Amino acid sequence: AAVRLSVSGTNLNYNGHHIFLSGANQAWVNYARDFGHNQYSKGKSTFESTLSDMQSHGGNSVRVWLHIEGESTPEFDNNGYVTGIDNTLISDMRAYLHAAQRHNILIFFTLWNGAVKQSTHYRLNGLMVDTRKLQSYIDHALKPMANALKNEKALGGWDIMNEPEGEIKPGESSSEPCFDTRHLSGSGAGWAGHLYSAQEIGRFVNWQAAAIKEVDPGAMVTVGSWNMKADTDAMGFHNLYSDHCLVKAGGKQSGTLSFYQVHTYDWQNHFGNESPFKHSFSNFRLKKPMVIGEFNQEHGAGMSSESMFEWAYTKGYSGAWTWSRTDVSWNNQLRGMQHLKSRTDHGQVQFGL
């Protein structure tokens, strides 16, 4: 019953000591087909070699994508309700967690993806727009999974969705400021389709956050936001993921995030003024920790991998995960991680589980 990973204000702690999360996105081996149906055994050698590489270069965490759009897990009925999970999903996830533990690495599982709309999107769509379908997922898949895995020492936490803003409706006025998306006009938001209102996305996150914390009250929960324009109330923007916004959207008082996660990439070799690489954490007026959850040197406006990890570590952020084992240069990412290996000035990076 010892407390492992926790939050204090805008810092992350492990066994009561200040830590920093340093690592990478896997984010998959076989996209949407890595766990359940005896699929882990198929990718085990890649997952294990990635863990070995990371341990030797001082990384302490990996982000991995789980359901995505419901291609292989969980199990759906013909009307889009969730009926359960297959009988090797949990045991596959546990085997991976045991491998991670042997290498002192924490795993963060990402449930859904909003950045692309493919042929099984209707499965995720139902859970987004129909609250009774969402509840079936919570009851028959999410709670069983979170309850079964909560005592695994290598379980870092849960990310509800990658980039929900891929499918948001921009340019919408609202009487509630946090649901107003006029500031996202011209931003690129809604690239996969103008499908969901800000309130619909907020409800989706609020309900799943509450569910995880009902069965694992000490769990870390986040959302991977595509851009700071949707993740701060400073600079003329609005934060879709604040406690106030999520509770207004879905009504569950416990359905709040543990920490924020933001992605950042340059455009024509420059970062926009909203980027966390152009400001200190304190500029954004947030009351939870923030992890920079996707970035890389290839889209880093001339910054080295080392400089990007250094900025995150020293300017008030609580983690940095490069994108990704599958994409761009893996050696660049490992060299970045290695820069922080022995560091303790802004939290421990090498700590035992």
DSSP string, 65-115: EEEETTSSSSEE-TTS-EEE--TTHHHHHHHHHHHHHHTT-EEEEEEEE-S
Domain of 99, in residue numbers:
1-353
Residue positions annotated with a catalytic role = 163, 294
Round to whole Å and give the CA distance between 193 and 168: 7
191 is in an annotated binding site: yes
Round to whole Å and give the CA distance between 231 and 225: 7
Round to whole Å and give the CA distance between 146 and 2: 18
Residue 331 is classified by DSSP as H
Q: Which two tokens stand for residue 241?
A: 């993921």
User: How many domains are there within the chain?
Assistant: 1
Q: Strand, coil or helix: what is 262?
A: strand
How far is it between the farthest Cα atoms of the chain? 54
Round to whole Å and give the CA distance between 167 and 180: 15
226 phi and psi angles, rounded to 5 deg: -70, -25
User: 127: closest CA among 177, 74, 62?
Assistant: 74
Q: What is the CATH number of the domain that holds 11?
A: 3.20.20.80
260 phi and psi angles, rounded to 5 deg: -95, 155
Residue 174 is classified by DSSP as -
283 is in an annotated binding site: no
> Resolution of this entry in Å?
1.6
Residues 318, 10: contact at Cβ < 8 Å?
yes
Residue 117 is classified by DSSP as -
162 is in an annotated binding site: yes
265 is in an annotated binding site: yes
Crossing angle of helices 305-314 and 330-339, rounded to 10°: 40
Q: Using alpha carbons, list the distances in angstroms from residue 315 to 25, 100, 274, 319, 321.
A: 22, 29, 15, 11, 15
For 83, residues 6+ apart whose C-beta sits below 8 A from its C-beta are: 74, 75, 76, 77, 136, 140
Give the residues after which the backbone of the chain is interrupted, taking a C-to-next-N distance over 2.5 angstroms as a break. none
User: 336: closest CA among 298, 310, 314, 316?
Assistant: 310
The residues that bridge with 320 in the sheet, in sequence order, are: 22, 292
Residues 87, 73: contact at Cβ < 8 Å?
no
User: 180: closest CA among 225, 229, 226, 131?
Assistant: 229
185, with CB counted inside 10 A (0-12, 13-18, 19+), is exposed
Residues 255, 190: contact at Cβ < 8 Å?
no
Whether a cis peptide bond, with omega within 30° of 0, leads into 27 is yes
Method: X-ray
Q: Using alpha carbons, list the distances in angstroms from residue 321 to 65, 108, 219, 297.
A: 14, 11, 19, 12
